Enzyme design. Structure first.
Site, PDB file in Angstrom:
ATOM      1  N   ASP A   1       0.818  -1.188   0.000  1.00 21.47           N
ATOM      2  CA  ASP A   1       0.000   0.000   0.000  1.00 21.47           C
ATOM      3  C   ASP A   1       0.867   1.259   0.000  1.00 21.47           C
ATOM      4  O   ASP A   1       1.319   1.724   1.060  1.00 21.47           O
ATOM      5  CB  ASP A   1      -0.920   0.005   1.228  1.00 21.47           C
ATOM      6  CG  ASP A   1      -1.965   1.076   1.164  1.00 21.47           C
ATOM      7  OD1 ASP A   1      -1.857   1.943   0.272  1.00 21.47           O
ATOM      8  OD2 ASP A   1      -2.924   1.016   1.976  1.00 21.47           O
ATOM      9  N   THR A   2       1.010   1.838  -1.190  1.00 24.06           N
ATOM     10  CA  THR A   2       1.778   3.071  -1.386  1.00 24.06           C
ATOM     11  C   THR A   2       1.100   4.277  -0.750  1.00 24.06           C
ATOM     12  O   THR A   2       1.760   5.272  -0.505  1.00 24.06           O
ATOM     13  CB  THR A   2       2.003   3.354  -2.875  1.00 24.06           C
ATOM     14  OG1 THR A   2       0.735   3.483  -3.557  1.00 24.06           O
ATOM     15  CG2 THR A   2       2.847   2.218  -3.495  1.00 24.06           C
ATOM     16  N   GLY A   3      -0.205   4.180  -0.509  1.00 23.45           N
ATOM     17  CA  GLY A   3      -0.990   5.203   0.173  1.00 23.45           C
ATOM     18  C   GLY A   3      -0.916   5.187   1.696  1.00 23.45           C
ATOM     19  O   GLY A   3      -1.505   6.034   2.372  1.00 23.45           O
TER      20      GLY A   3
END
Ligand SMILES: CC(C)CN(C[C@@H](O)[C@H](Cc1ccccc1)NC(=O)O[C@H]1CO[C@H]2OCC[C@H]21)S(=O)(=O)c1ccc(N)cc1
Lengths: 99, 99
Positions: free
Chosen positions: A25-27
């Site tokens: 999850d880059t967020g």
């Protein structure tokens, strides 16, 4: 590997001796795991997302294994609906977004 | 380009004629933007994250300009704390995770 995004990017991790599935999850700034009984020193924290805030236990310097990568860092534990691998650990496995 | 994850992967998008900053979010199934006017038909939807669900407006077939790439797909509008570009549009720009 190179992982496409047509489906959720889920990987197997091992933490506190247990195998889990988690989302890359880059967020997410920080790694957040579903409620589990991890041993060790922790401090409380609040994290905010879509839907608002959850209280988490912040454990520092925890070993985690992520697709064979052995890393050590911070893991938040609390009522997330999905196990999330955030940027603090994505950077340790050398993960990049490419297009 | 190849984006490292030491910092939040923030980009400039254009939607409905207006420039905005948004987060490239591999953990989001769907693209969700902060409250804004947008022309078009929409319908109400609930989406769920950390903290619970929020109610949003679902607009289909919206062109979005992302880092020079013109894509078309579903955009949800509502009280998200950040503009998030989810997989539904990341796939349209050929985005992958690599490590
Ligand atoms: C909103 C972001 C700025 C941050 N979120 C990470 C994000 O990737 C979550 C990660 C996520 C994923 C599933 C469930 C909860 C949270 N996704 C999310 O809210 O996506 C929603 C939009 O599309 C839908 O698809 C999945 C849920 C919906 S977050 O989960 O709240 C979050 C916040 C802080 C940390 N440290 C870790 C995670």
């Amino acid at each position: 590997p190179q992982i496409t995004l047509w489906k959720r990017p889920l990987v197997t991790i091992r933490i506190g001796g247990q195998l889990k599935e988690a989302l890359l999850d880059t967020g997410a700034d920080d790694t957040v795991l579903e409620e589990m009984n991890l041993p060790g020193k922790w401090k409380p924290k609040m994290i905010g997302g879509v839907g608002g805030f959850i209280k988490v236990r912040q454990y520092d310097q925890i070993p985690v294994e992520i697709c064979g990568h052995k890393v050590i860092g911070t893991v938040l534990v609390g009522p997330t609906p999905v196990n999330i691998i955030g940027r603090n650990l994505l950077t340790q496995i050398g993960c990049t977004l490419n297009f």
